Design a protein around this ligand. Sequence first.
Ligand SMILES: Cc1cc2nc3c(=O)[nH]c(=O)nc-3n(C[C@H](O)[C@H](O)[C@H](O)COP(=O)(O)OP(=O)(O)OC[C@H]3O[C@@H](n4cnc5c(N)ncnc54)[C@H](O)[C@@H]3O)c2cc1C
Ligand SMILES: Cc1cc2nc3c(=O)[nH]c(=O)nc-3n(C[C@H](O)[C@H](O)[C@H](O)COP(=O)(O)OP(=O)(O)OC[C@H]3O[C@@H](n4cnc5c(N)ncnc54)[C@H](O)[C@@H]3O)c2cc1C
Lengths: 499, 497
Amino acid sequence: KKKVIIIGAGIAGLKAASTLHQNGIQDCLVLEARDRVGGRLQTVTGYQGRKYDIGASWHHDTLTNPLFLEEAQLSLNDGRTRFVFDDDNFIYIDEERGRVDHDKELLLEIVDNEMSKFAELEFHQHLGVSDCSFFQLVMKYLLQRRQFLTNDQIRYLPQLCRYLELWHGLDWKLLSAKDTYFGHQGRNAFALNYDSVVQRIAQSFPQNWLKLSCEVKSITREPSKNVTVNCEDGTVYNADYVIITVPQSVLNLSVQPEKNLRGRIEFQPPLKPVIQDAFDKIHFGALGKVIFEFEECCWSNESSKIVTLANSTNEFVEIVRNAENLDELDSMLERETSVTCWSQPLFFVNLSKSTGVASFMMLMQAPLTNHIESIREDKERLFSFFQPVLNKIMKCLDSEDVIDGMRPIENIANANKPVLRNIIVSNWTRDPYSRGAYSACFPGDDPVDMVVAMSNGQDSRIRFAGEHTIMDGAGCAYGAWESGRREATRISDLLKLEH
Amino acid sequence: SPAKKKVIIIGAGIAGLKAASTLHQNGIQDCLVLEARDRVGGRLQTVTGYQGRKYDIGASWHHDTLTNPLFLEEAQLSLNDGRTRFVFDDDNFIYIDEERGRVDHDKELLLEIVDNEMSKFAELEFHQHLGVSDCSFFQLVMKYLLQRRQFLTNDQIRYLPQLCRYLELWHGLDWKLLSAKDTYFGHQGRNAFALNYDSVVQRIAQSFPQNWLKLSCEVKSITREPSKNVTVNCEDGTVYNADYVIITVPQSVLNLSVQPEKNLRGRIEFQPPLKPVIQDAFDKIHFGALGKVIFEFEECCWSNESSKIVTLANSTNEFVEIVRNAENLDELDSMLERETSVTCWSQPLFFVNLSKSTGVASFMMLMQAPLTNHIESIREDKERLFSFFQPVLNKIMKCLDSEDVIDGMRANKPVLRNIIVSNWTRDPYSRGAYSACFPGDDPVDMVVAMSNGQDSRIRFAGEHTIMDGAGCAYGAWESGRREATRISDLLKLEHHH
Ligand SMILES: Cc1cc2nc3c(=O)[nH]c(=O)nc-3n(C[C@H](O)[C@H](O)[C@H](O)COP(=O)(O)OP(=O)(O)OC[C@H]3O[C@@H](n4cnc5c(N)ncnc54)[C@H](O)[C@@H]3O)c2cc1C
Ligand SMILES: Cc1cc2nc3c(=O)[nH]c(=O)nc-3n(C[C@H](O)[C@H](O)[C@H](O)COP(=O)(O)OP(=O)(O)OC[C@H]3O[C@@H](n4cnc5c(N)ncnc54)[C@H](O)[C@@H]3O)c2cc1C
């Protein structure tokens, strides 16, 4: 009875439905499992009503990002602020040494740039001759260029370069080296409300099209020119075309046994082998977020980008200087516990400079993400965990130790002391409808496979959309947005041509 | 009577020297290296100044150290004997504007950040694309500004265009003369400042029979005897006959060959004349004029925060309003036209603070065309030079926590003891710095014509005859190795049964 049934109300599904309406097609649905739209785009509220995108926050590749350009046109026409360019010079902090950024002797940023060029030459034309982990690649660089690196450069550079872990959401021993470096097509623009983007799109079509709390449990299309979809409860539907936009990791459940898994869809017939094979090419990263809200800013706003480096040792240097080769370096590196805020790099966005708000938006990676999100309810433990890194930042920013006021006790003796009032944590890895952040590469993965399979679709009536179904903007909000327009337009042309 | 030689190499620059080095390495005997000047090295020349201080007035850096083959050789040497042959002197750039002072790493201007976006803008503009017309670098920057105006602050629109111009000192061409297609490009790793490029020249020169080198002989003509013999005449009248010749004269000097008048210094008369494919290539490639000036001071009495300093050319707010009001590329290109001499603030200038990198109290400054030609044309008037650069020198000292300079060519103040200038645009054996592109230029042409040769016996080498390392010391180096190796392969058959 329906022209098109869109599964999932994330940006992919919403743009699609928005596009269909825009082209005059009627009688369409949008089945969302959650009781809200937005998918991995969620803006939450905390202390004093401040808002934060606990999901996607930035407009990437602003030079060609069509979604951004659309947002730009709007703002150009009405003068309203919808975003801010918050790129800035990064401040790097080592627990013991303090700041190490833009240093007249360490010059870490410069060797970091040679490092990147190194990775490029390494996989250039050879189909990534036996890929390895980002970690293995950095060690190869160090061994090969030690003659031209000082002791401190060999010590801090590898800890600094790991900021890239916050781009992929994966530890450097788990990340594929071939996909580590990417093409930054322009500056980034912090969205001053991705929810505003969600609402504008969400409203571009008939409200009655949306069906929240509809967990699709099975999709089938008996050869008769019709596709039949069923949600968990019991309601059934049928349409001419269907666009599946669930995340990759959820759609990956369709291959295993036990339709018991929350989110998993039952395809009949089963998704063709070219699709199932794609999942063997790894995927799914775990970018997480922790928001630190203070009463007010009493620290320096020199920069909005701050990164704390995991501890490092001088013995590491000695080992590098002495390794005869890659193997000797590998084993020689045998340090045979307990994770702390200094066991991995952490990315903090100082929102005071870019947005005025006195809070820090922090990014974390797997395996830390899963752990921190597991104890998201225990605010006390959370504060104790991050307190040491939160204190080093304040010291490096002309302030002092943080005071714990999550259980407030108004005291005049806090005038110029930073007072923490609330802590917010993401939960993507524990949410059955997301099970992580976005597609990422493990050593040996090939992202293109899935793009082709997804884009080709199960068949003429079963199409796919989402951040894991396109090449440009892969794993990005604008990527999913465009993929949603892709399928809608394809189906939109076909319908017009019939009648 | 004219002496017989297996191979004759014309020119003793690095290309010619590495050619000889390779030939000897492969057991080839009875060769010859003929050089017009009274020294070896060509565009690799280290001079002496105040108190015996040394400076490379030609090439001074090893570029692309991740893959640069000449650099790797020198590094293996230092790794074995522990002698200092080079120093990685890359640093954070200090940018200075005459009115505003330092504008680098500025928390509000963020010039370096949008400069990077510019690079990507340029990259998306050309790279991989077919049928894209070229333009000047200047024009490319104007387009960027117009298209991204909505996301740039007034001060970013004023100063970014002036900072982008540090690239002029990489090509030796003013932004309006420089082809945008050839402006940007990746560098394979950090640069390494040679602590005597002349030490590299000597090592290669000493790696082959010393009786092969014949300095002070300017070659006037090359003739191919249709019988496997090439006749070469020196100006002093000596005549030679060789099986092969490797011609490494600068591209600007070889260009004289395709013109009437054989009395110009360095010109070679070719019989038969250079094939049509070669002459014609001279239209699709040009020559830039990177130039230098060494300012020697008594002692360092200034901040050593960085070894890299760049003074931007003056800018105006009227430029901003025009960019803001422009309605399109045409209006902007038009609006940009008003109603006046050249000073040290009319173009960007690059200064290398040697005190930090080498501990020597001097500045090595790079200049570009057209300024280069004008400054070299007065290198003799030292007072005129000091007056011309005094304002930028003062501004730099102020920014490095010091005071105005004191003319001391005749306590805590900087005293200029000497000024040294380059002479490449005037030296008839150079006629400029190195190969460069003007909008519409296609360097691939010359490389192909040169690497293909005049014929089987008449070959070419030099910085203008190869892609990888084009314009660089290691490109000329490799090109020499290439022609020598080819000749060795051919002479190999001489021992087949
Ligand atoms: C912490 C974090 C930070 C990020 N930051 C950025 C950033 O700064 N910039 C950027 O560009 N991208 C960012 N991303 C990625 C971006 O959020 C995603 O690419 C994008 O939201 C994916 O859109 P989508 O429409 O495909 O799916 P949305 O999740 O992304 O999901 C599709 C919809 O399917 C629904 N669904 C799932 N299972 C079922 C079922 N069985 N039945 C019915 N409905 C179902 C879901 O509930 C969901 O609403 C970030 C992601 C994370 C996790
Ligand atoms: C100011 C300046 C700065 C530079 N800086 C760098 C740098 O930092 N890094 C880098 O890699 N490169 C740099 N270069 C470029 C580098 O110096 C050249 O690429 C390289 O030296 C060219 O070598 P060549 O052997 O081809 O020619 P050499 O000049 O370059 O010339 C070949 C030889 O031919 C001789 N000759 C000419 N005509 C005749 C004739 N008729 N008879 C006999 N002999 C003749 C000449 O006298 C000369 O010795 C710079 C160049 C200049 C001008």
